[model samples]
Target: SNAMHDALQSILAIQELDIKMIRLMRVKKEHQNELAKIQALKTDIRRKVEEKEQEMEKLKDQIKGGEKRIQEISDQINKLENQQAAVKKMDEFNALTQEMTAANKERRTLEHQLSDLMDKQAGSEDLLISLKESLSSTENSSSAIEEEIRENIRKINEEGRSLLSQRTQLKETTDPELFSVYERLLNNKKDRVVVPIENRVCSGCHIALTPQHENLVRKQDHLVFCEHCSRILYWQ
Candidate 1:
């Protein structure tokens, strides 16, 4: 009877640990999940800055090509002016200069447009760079936040280790058949595999214990389960 009493007492302690461990695990999971969210936001910011840099690069190349085209127009005008020594019809000469002048005007117009585009892209890139810097600054602080939250879980983790050790010893020394039955219930209940019986009621389910079952549980003859919740029944 003393051996039976001790075994049931150990079960109660193990069940207490199980409940606490579940809560600790829940907090740890929530902590990791929020950390993932911050990292996801950081990735989006990195992508946005990269896209702006690409746009800035396009503007730079566009300006280089525009300058080259303008130089080609100047070359055409210079070659046409040298044509007069070889002699050409007045009509053809004037028409050629006028066409060169028009091309020069069009080239200059587009050249200025490219310059404007370059300015806009430069401003856009700088602004995005600034924004990303601020976001990363916030991201840097998240480590501190993570550390603070995990510190609580850290203590809980230590407690969990102790509880697991206790459970391991209890399970190791318990009768194989007794432990087998308890193990099955532990897996099914997920927590509180053993619970108290008070006032002829099952504390695990809060259901009234049948008179005969109550008598059997109090006898301490064998490990007994609550009929309603299937938890190992214990007493004060």
Candidate 2:
């Protein structure tokens, strides 16, 4: 009787811890995948931001060169005016003035374009800063979650090992043939190999037991198996 009683108790003990271990294992894998995704996203975002910044710097240099050219054109026009005042050559003076006017117009257009580009660059910089902050926060959160999940898995593994050891110890009292059958069923069904009877039902399969099976299990003189699931049934 103690052989059967001890085996049943060990099965229940393993079942409870096995369920927890299975859940922890699943959660640990999910957290690891999520952490990898977050890291990849952060890398991509940083690369894009750096490319934009380089482009912005090139545009700024072009704008400065345009401004310098505009200043040189203005100085040349002033010099041409002084020469025209002395030469009295109307055609040459008119041509120089026209050239200077065109140059000034081109410079103004470039200035407007540069202003727009600067605004766009500023916006891009702000967006990059925001993304960096978001990435930092996400990474921190992911790290914390990953650590917690790892800790949970370690705890579950330790507990599972202890339970398995206890189960092995308890099995020493069981009949070898009976324990072999139990192990086969347990390997196939895991936590469902043995279950307590409740309300005239086989808790393993949730099936109602016949009067004969119920009476047999209640007698506790011999081991009883549920007809539906073939699991050892115990009256609690």
Candidate 3:
């Protein structure tokens, strides 16, 4: 009787630690997810910075195009002036003068457009600087936060190791056959595999038991199994 009782006590102690370890594992998973979220934010900010850099490069290309257009217009005006110098007819010279006037007006309009593009480029550059500053600051703060989360996970792992050590020691005292049965049930249910009978009801299943079944548990000569939950039954 005492041998069975001792075996039950040993397994019960091991089960307590197993439950604790399971809970610790759950907490560790949550901490990992928290760390992943911070990493995702960091990745998102880096993508934004890359996209902004590309936009600035495109703006630079547009500005170069605008400057090239202005240079081409200036070359056309120089060619017109030379043509006017060689002209003999006053009518042809006057016509060339009107053409030069129109060209200058278009060149001035293009200059104004180019100035607006430069202003936009400057604004974007300022925004890029600010974005980089924010990204750096976030990295600095998140580094500390991530460290704290890792520390919590480390503590949980340490506690789990301690619990596992204790459970291992207690397992050595338990009956091998009984312990295997408990392991099988615990693996399947992830809950109390050995439970007490209270008021003739199987505590694990909360189901009423026949008097014959109750008598077998009261005797405690051998292991009594609960029909509904398949947990070992004992009188508390």
Candidate 4:
């Protein structure tokens, strides 16, 4: 039968659609990766902001602890001075004075450390503000970009469905055996499974075709497959 001829034309048409579908899928994959990258950026920024806020809290806690330690030292100094006023022995008085001096020295060191803590806390506050601003900006920009990517994917999928429908109809006109062979090759290669022999070369693999192969394709008595790429070869 001329089933080979009918199968050839139908498979060629389906091949065209399959190529388009492959391109659409490639584009869809790129868009999906773009969406994933955007989401990763948003999550990274949010995590940074969270880490900064936690760091600021730790600074605040340190400052609070420093202040409490300074207050306790001052209280101890005041109590020691009062004890000095009530002391009867000079040795006891000297010991009390030494304790007061040590307490004041500790208080001065604590004050210095507290000042450093305050400066650090202020720096962290500024950093947190910037981090929050960056987070918001990232979110704002990514939302729009993510939406655009999704829309592109949606359109690609829509076109893919149309292509599938067309290919489905074309399959009906295609010879079952030939279509099955084409499908096997298409699944393996995802490109042109049936190709023309041009200038005695396999167009699919761009390899020189044997004279026998070229003659077989030209005769068109049956299907001819390229030895190099295994794609169905046609004369035209």
Model 4 lDDT tens row, 116-212: 9899889888988998899888888678778878888899999999999998988876788888899899999989989987877888899998787
TM-score of each candidate structure, all chains considered together = 0.81, 0.61, 0.82, 0.94
Model 4, CA-based lDDT: 0.87
Give a tens-digit lDDT track for model 3, residues 97-184: 9999999999999999999999989999998998899899999989999999999999999998899888888887789999999999
Top candidate by TM-score: 4
Worst 10 residues of 1 by lDDT: 79-88
Question: Which tens-of-lDDT digit does each residue in 129-215 have in candidate 1?
Answer: 797887779779777886777787688778889878987877766666766777788777777777778777898789998888888
At residue 89, candidate 3 shows an lDDT of: 99
Query: Which candidate leads the pack in lDDT?
Result: 3
| Model 2 TM-score relative to the real fold | 0.61
Q: Supply candidate 3's per-residue lDDT for 70.
A: 99
Score residue 18 of candidate 3 by CA lDDT: 81
Q: What's the count of clashing pairs in each model shown? A: 0, 0, 0, 0
Q: Which candidate do you rate higher for lDDT, 2 or 3?
A: 3
**Per-residue alpha-carbon lDDT of candidate 2 for residues 1-236, written as tens digits (9 for 90 to 100):** 66667666666665565566556667767766766777787788777768867876886787677677767767776786777677657788788778767867876876787677678777877877887787677677677776776677677678767766875675665466666776687777866676789988988889999898898998777778889889988888
lDDT of 2 at 72: 78
Residue runs of model 3 more than 4 Å from their true location after superposition? 89-116
Which regions of candidate 1 are displaced past 4 Å? 81-88, 105-109, 149-159
lDDT of 2 at 204: 85
lDDT for model 1 comes to 0.78
TM-score, candidate 3, is 0.82
